[PDB]
Structures are given as structure tokens and as C-alpha cells.
Amino acid sequence: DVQLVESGGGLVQPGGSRKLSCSASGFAFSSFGMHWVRQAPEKGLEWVAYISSGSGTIYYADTVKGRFTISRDDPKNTLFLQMTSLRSEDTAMYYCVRSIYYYGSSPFDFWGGTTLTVSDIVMTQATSSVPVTPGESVSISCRSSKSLLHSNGNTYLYWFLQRPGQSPQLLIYRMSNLASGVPDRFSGSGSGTAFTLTISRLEAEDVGVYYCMQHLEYPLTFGAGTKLEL
Amino acid sequence: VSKAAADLMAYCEAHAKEDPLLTPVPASENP
Amino acid sequence: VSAEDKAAAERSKEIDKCLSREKTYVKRLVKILLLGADNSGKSTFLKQMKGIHEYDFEIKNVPFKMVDVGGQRSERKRWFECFDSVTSILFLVDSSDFNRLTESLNDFETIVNNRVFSNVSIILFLNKTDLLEEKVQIVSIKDYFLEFEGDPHCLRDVQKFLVECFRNKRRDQQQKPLYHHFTTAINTENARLIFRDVKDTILHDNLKQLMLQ
Amino acid sequence: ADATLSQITNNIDPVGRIQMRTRRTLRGHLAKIYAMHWGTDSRLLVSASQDGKLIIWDSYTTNKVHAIPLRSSWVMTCAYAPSGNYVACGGLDNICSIYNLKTREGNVRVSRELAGHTGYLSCCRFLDDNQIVTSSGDTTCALWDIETGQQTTTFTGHTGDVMSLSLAPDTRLFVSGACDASAKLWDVREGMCRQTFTGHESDINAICFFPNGNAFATGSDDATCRLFDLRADQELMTYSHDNIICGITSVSFSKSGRLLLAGYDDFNCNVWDALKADRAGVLAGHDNRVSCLGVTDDGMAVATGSWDSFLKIWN
Amino acid sequence: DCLFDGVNELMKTLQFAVHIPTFVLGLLLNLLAIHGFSTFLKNRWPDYAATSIYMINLAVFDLLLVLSLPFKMVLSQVQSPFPSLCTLVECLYFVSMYGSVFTICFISMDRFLAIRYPLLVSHLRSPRKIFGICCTIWVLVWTGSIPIYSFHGYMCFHNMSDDTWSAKVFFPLEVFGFLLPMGIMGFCCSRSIHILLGRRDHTQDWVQQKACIYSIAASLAVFVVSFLPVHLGFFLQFLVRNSFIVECRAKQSISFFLQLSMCFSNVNCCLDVFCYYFVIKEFRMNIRA
Ligand SMILES: CCCCCCCCCCCCCCCC(=O)OC[C@@H](O)COP(=O)(O)O[C@@H]1[C@H](O)[C@H](O)[C@@H](O)[C@H](O)[C@H]1O
């Protein structure tokens, strides 16, 4: 089974350096690009860095540019993130995210979990929380600055869900396709500049924080967290 | 034999509108 | 070309690099197709050194692949066209055998006279030659071959007559050379002969490529 | 027989010359190309090369999405599942390999290894996600379910080796050509032959179904193609030329059936007009004998595969 | 004193009698050889492209020499008021000659390499290496040729300077234009012939290569009859320019021999079409239809 396990975190004094490691057991790590996505306490997700399958193309975030290094060890099946000159704003909950890019592929599916504490398309959801009684379809809306519709017919919008105390999991990839192992109640639709998420039924499993992300260009910007709860 | 040939011609004429190879597709519409 | 199409292009580049990394091996590979008979001793010859078998080995830093199609071989040209790229065709026969000589000669004539293998050299092996002298001493040659001329009890004459009869089945001589060998069932020097014949075939190919004539 | 097809079609205007150009060329294989199949999305195609390789491409952008090594190098056919999850292959190893492309591991592994055919596999075409129809050189065809792998029904009656197999649009009947200069129409649900046709004088190398499912054109090694009708139970028309003295390796029909594409052994392909029984186009650009030829589902592009280790997309 | 009026009076008419039909035949012969082999570069590339490269190189060197012939023909009797036309004609003449020589030597070397090690050259043999080798042949010929004719100049191909016939400029010419190429030709032909004749024990079918054991035996022959007397005359003339041979009735004979050998070496541009281009069966079927 797929299993990404991250370690190397802890408490770091300001201005220090550290290394975060991630084992990638249970799948072909050589054919999957890897992303680092952190989450500040009581905040949303923000992309950090990305490395391709062949370690040819490497991308960073403007906040961590020139400060963070991302490396891949294919023979050992491991991902490394080296951080230096840390600041108090680096406290987050880092996650290693799988990806793979071909025709019909579904990137950003499997995540992990690790904790680190230190002593551009605009995507946001204005609705902080949407309380709703179970039994009726619930709609979640996410706003974007540019248009995610591409000349080839692709709309790079990603719908993820994070349950309390858990890790985010991919609900919908490319704004119209559901990830494997998901209930059929979830659906997604929308225009080039507007998108919507529909949930047919609500259960104890469906309560959580919903996030919207764009993959049109780097850096990948997340939306706001819609707290769907009963 | 004649009925089969007539049916073949009728089917060919009915679906002759949607043959991208028969009618040169415009470059903008060309995949 | 979006941010995800660039990654797909990079993956395609990696795949193409992987394919091109092994393009030297396919050129360096030397293919020999085995077309022996049941009584020829093909199994013993293979053990010394439709079930399709492939034996891959290395001789003098040269990769050799022997394709054994024993059990079922079709006469359709589509089946035979799959082996038009092999370097050599090895034909194994039983020299000591008497009644099977005509059938093996017919098989050799059918194999050689096909246009599919016009660019493939033919190697001939005559196994179990240690019993050939005893067989020719017990029973002469002229009895089983009216056209034979010479001493029926001379081993060299018998070998020469067999070689001539085998080579007479070649309708065309200009295409590729035809070779021959005489080995027993216990010797372990057939690999050197195979390598020498492969080198001779390669030299002939280079001569034809050089357009020296 | 009362009126010939040519007599009725004489009133139809000729199509005229059609020029089809190579939009993109697919390269990367290291040996001869023996088969290809068009995916249901009309963008993904799978091809088999005698270096023991299977490649699934992106025909729109010439992008290599999948590259699968094969256990046996001597492979003669390949197939694509209608749903797009599995790919079939077969050859001289008398085994049909089904590969699954949607593994959670991220790679492609062989889903199943069907065995039971005495001779080499000469054609495999998927019926659904859990069924497949195969033909072998042991002069018989078979129906397999990939859930268990047992021969649900074995179709026997062919004298020579079966060469090509095509399935009807309704996936209820099919037709197979063999080396006995005859073509047999078999029923999947029933399991015995109903119609047999003998018009050719040599080995039939390819067969395909008309889009309406009531006729089929087949080519042989006598450099002629012949069209037969199921209801008429007789030969309809022969497409041949005096300048053509090479056998036909593959055939394919257009969406409307007006243009029939046939690959020959003279380093090129022909595009005949089925109704007018006259040559209409020539596909040239291959420096070797063309093996496989396929018309896409949408009818836009046509893919050709030859012995020059190159695949050409035409439109 | 020594007067060379008689030898020149004879050699002018000798050139006018021998060189005109030599140029006339060689022009058409090379214009047929080039077009004949240009077909193999458009329809038989993967097989004969590697050979056609240096074949066409040799053909174009022969054509350059053939085209330079009528200009020395014109300027062997009259003087044109130009100090650059003679230099250009001399440079083209000698560059074409010693380029054809090097091309023939490289052809022999390539044959010997393709024969002695067939498996090694079954992989490392592409027209890119041969294109680079032809390019370096042109480059080497030009750099070794220009600093010689830059110190030549009353007439054209007559009365060379006293530094053209010096040891430092004649010994390199003899060494790099006759000795080494002749030794390489001899080795690469004798070894190749012995190897091709030793195929009898490998396979009785050696008779299938009968013609292959004669074409090289022609290459080792028409090379001597068109390059040995010329360099012998060069050595003799160099001997008689640094106070070694001084006598009448002898220097005249040496001048006659050198001029006649240089006039007869120019039929090698016509004998190379029979040596190399005509012994190929495919060429014969291509140019005859
Ligand atoms: C590095 C190697 C390759 C590089 C490219 C090739 C470069 C060198 C090419 C060769 C040049 C060799 C020198 C010139 C030879 C030549 O062409 O020589 C004319 C002969 O004719 C000799 O005659 P020359 O020395 O000129 O003078 C007599 C009167 O010509 C005559 O008329 C009179 O009768 C006589 O007594 C002499 O006075």
C-alpha cells in the first residue's frame, strides 16, 4: 500500500537549520514528482517546493526562495528538504504530496504528516464556515483571480478535504473528475472563472475543511478553508 | 444483392457529412 | 503548454532517453535460428553449451541469442518472416544416420531455397560423427546412394560426398556463404566455430557494404 | 444476384484525389512495428514493436505516456480496452498478456497471462472489461474472461491458420479470416459458425467490419481485396490493380464507409473508393512495408505503422 | 652553357597533343561519375552513403584538376598580364592532385580497416566520421599547399623560385605525397588481399569474391603508373637544382622526363573512373539504362 512517512521535525531556534526526510514506501517513487505543502497553525495550506520525477525541473516559493532546498534519492526512495536561516513564521505542519503528470493523470492524491515549530494567482473563499443540516445538497464556492481554463480544454482546479486531526485527501482533480476511492455524492462543476462543489449527502465522514487550489502556473496557490460541519 | 448495395449507398450518403478525412477539415478545427 | 504539460514532456524525454540507452544492445546482438531435427541431437547440443526458446549468452564480449523453435514450425511465410533479421541459421544433422539423410536434405533444400532468408548465412553441423565411421564400416555408402562415386569405406570420401550433397541444394551461391563442420557429441568447441562463422558473415556484410565489386 | 454493385454505383459522382499529410511522426521504437490499436478517446494509441516493446502515445502532441517491456520479443498483435484500463498483447509465445494501466503503485503490470492456445496468437480484440476474443495459428479462435481465464467458447472449423479478427459494433458477432482462402462469421453467444465465404485464391491476411455491421472487406496475398455482404451471402466487389502485385497486410474502413484504407507490401498504402471501386488516394512516406493501419474513432486522423520503426499520423 | 630551346619546343607540342584529349575525356567522365553516384545518396543512403562520400570527394578533386588543365594549356605558350591567374591555376592544379592522392590513400585505409576488423567497424562506421575525414583532408591539403605556391613567381608552370626547390620544401613534399601514401596503399592492399584469400579454409565460397581480389589488385597498380615516375622526376629535378648534376645532354633529358611524367599523370583523373567507379556493378547498371 502507498505510504509516505515524514520525519525530522521538532522545535528549532530562530535562525537555525534542519533537514526533513520523507520515506515513500509502497509505490514507484522514481516516476512520481514530489511536492512540499505546509500548514500554519489555525491557517490554510501553502505550497513550498516541487521536484520532478527525474529531478530535472525544481520549483520553489517566493517566501522560501534561496532558503529551502529540495532533493530526491531514487535508490533510497526518499525526499529531503533542507531549511536554513529559519524565521518564526516557518512554524507549520509539513506534508509530502505525490504527483504524476501524463494524459489522464491525477496528481496531488497522497499526503503524509510531520510537525515543525520555530520559536501569483489569488485563490480565496470568502465563506469561513457553512453550517448545514444533513440531508440536503451543500454547495461550496471558490474564487480565482485569473481564468483556469486553458486553450486545450483543461481547467486546473483541485478540490481537497482535510478531516479534523487527519491529512488532506484529493476529492476532485481538474475541476470535473473525482479521485479514486471517493463517494459518488461529491461532484464539481463551473465556468472558466467560477467553480462550485456539490455534496449530495452529509455524514460524520464529510465534516471537515475544504480547500481549493490551482495548478495553472507556479507557485500553486491554495484557497481558503471552508469549514463544512453539522 | 441489389438491396444490399442500395442500403450501403444510403448509409454512405447519410453519414457522408461527418467524415473528417473525406472533407478537408480547416486548420483551426484540425486537431 | 501549461505547467502540467511541461512535466509530461519531461517524462516523455526521460522515456526516450531510456529507450535510446539500449539502442546499442539491439545492434550488437547476433541472432542464430536453430532448425535441427529430432534425431539430430539438438537437445544434447544445447545442453552441452509450439515451445519457443531463447538462449542468450556472451562469446568474446559479443552477445549471442539462439532461437529454438523445436516442436512446431509453420510453413506460412508470415511465420518465417519474423526471422528475416537473424544473422545466421544453424542446421543440425545426424551424419551417422542413414534413412533420415533424405528427409534432412529435403528440409535443408526447403529452408535454403526460401526468399525470406536471402540475407542470412547458413551454418551446417554434422553431429554424432564418432558413430559415422562404425556405421560406414558396417554398411557401405553406395548401397544407400546410387549416385555416390568413390571408395564406400573411406571416411574422408563419405564426408566429402555428404558435404557435396548438402551444398548442391543451394540454388543461388552469390547471396551468402554456406559453411560446414564435423563435431562429435562430447566435444566442447562448437562455440568457437559459431563465433568464427559469425565473424565471416559480418566480414561478408562489410564487403558488400563497401561496394568493392 | 441481379444487379452488380458497380452498375448501381455508376450514377454516383467520383470522390476524386485526396491528399492526406503526415501531421506528426511518432518515433522512438528500435525495431519493426507489427501492430497498433486506436484508443476510444481518439488521442491515445498503443503500438507493438518486435524489439519486445509496447508504447502508448499521445497522438495529439507526440508524447510518450507509457512504455512497457514485453516478456516475449516475438509479438504480432496488440489491443486497447474500450474502457481504456487494459491493453492486450500476444505473439509467438502462445500467450495473451493483459496489462493494467491504472495500478495504484504508479506503474503498469501484467493483469493476467492467458494460456491455452496450441499455436501462436495472431489477433486479440477486447469485447469488454472482462472478456476478450483471440485467434491462433492452431486454426481456431477462443473467447476468454479475464476474471478466471478459462475458454468460455472455442470456435473451430478453420482449416488454415487464422490471421486477423474484427468485432462488430454491437459486440455480438464477429468475422475471422484464415489461410484457407475463406472467411467465417461467428456468433459470440451461440458459439458456432453461421456463414462461410470463399472468394479469394490465397491466404487472407486482414479483415474489418463495415461501420453499419452488415458487410466486411477482406484482403489477401493475391494483391486483391474483396467485399462481402452478410445478407447477400455473395461477393460484392473486388478492388485490385494490375500495377499492384503485393499482398495486403491491413485494412480499415472510414466512418461512412466511402474510403477503405489498405496497407500493401510495396512500401505504401492505398485509399480505395468502396462504392466506385476505383483508386482514390495514395499514402506514401514509409521506406518499408507497412504492417498496421488504423482509422481513429472520430474519423479525423489515420495512424500507420511500418518496418522502419516509425509511426505516422495522417490527416 | 645549357640551352633548353629544343626540349621546350618538343614539350609544348607534346602537351598540346596529350593534355587536350585528357581534359576532354576526364571532364565528361567525372561529370558522369558524379551524377551517377549522386543517385546512391538519395535512394541507397544507409548502404552506400559511406562509400559515396569519399567517392564523390575523389570525383570532385579530379574534376577540379580537369578544369584547371585548359588554363595551364593556354598559359604554357602565351603570357597574360596578370600575376594572380597563374598563382590561382597552379594552386588549383596541385591542390586537386594531392587531394586525389590523399583521398585514394584514405579509401585504401578504410577498406583495410573494414576487412581486418569487421565487428569493430560494424558499429563505428557512419558517414559523419567520413565527412569529418574529408573535411580534414581538404583542410590539410590547403594548409600544406598555400605556403608553397605563395613563393612560386616569367611564365606559368615554369622557372620556379630558388626556395621552391629547397630541402625544407621538397623533402616534406616527397615524404607526405609519395612515400607515406605509397607505403599505406601497399600495406592496406597486400594485407587485404591476403586476408580475402585466406577465406578459402573458412568457407569454400571464397570464389564468390573473385572480383574483390582483383579490384584492389588494380588499385595497387594504376597508382604506381601515375605517381611513381612523377616523383622520380621531381627528385631528379631537385637533384639538378642544388649543384649535384651539371652536364649538357643530361639536364635536358631530366627536364623532358619530368614534364612528360607530369603530363601523363593527368590521365589518372580518367583512370580513376575505371579503377573505382566502373568496377562497381551497381554503377554500371545505374549509368547504363
Ligand atoms: C605537403 C604536400 C602536399 C601539398 C600540396 C602540393 C604542394 C606541392 C605541389 C608540387 C610542387 C613542386 C614544385 C614545382 C614542380 C613543377 O611543376 O616544376 C616544373 C618543371 O618544369 C621544372 O622546371 P622548373 O624548375 O620550373 O624550371 C625549368 C623550366 O620550367 C624548363 O622550361 C627549363 O627547360 C628547365 O631547364 C628549368 O629551368
Ligand SMILES: *[C@@H]1O[C@H](CO)[C@@H](O)[C@H](O)[C@H]1NC(C)=O
Ligand atoms: C628564370 O628566372 C630568373 C630570374 O629572373 C632568370 O634569371 C632566368 O634566366 C630564368 N630562366 C629561364 C627563363 O629559363
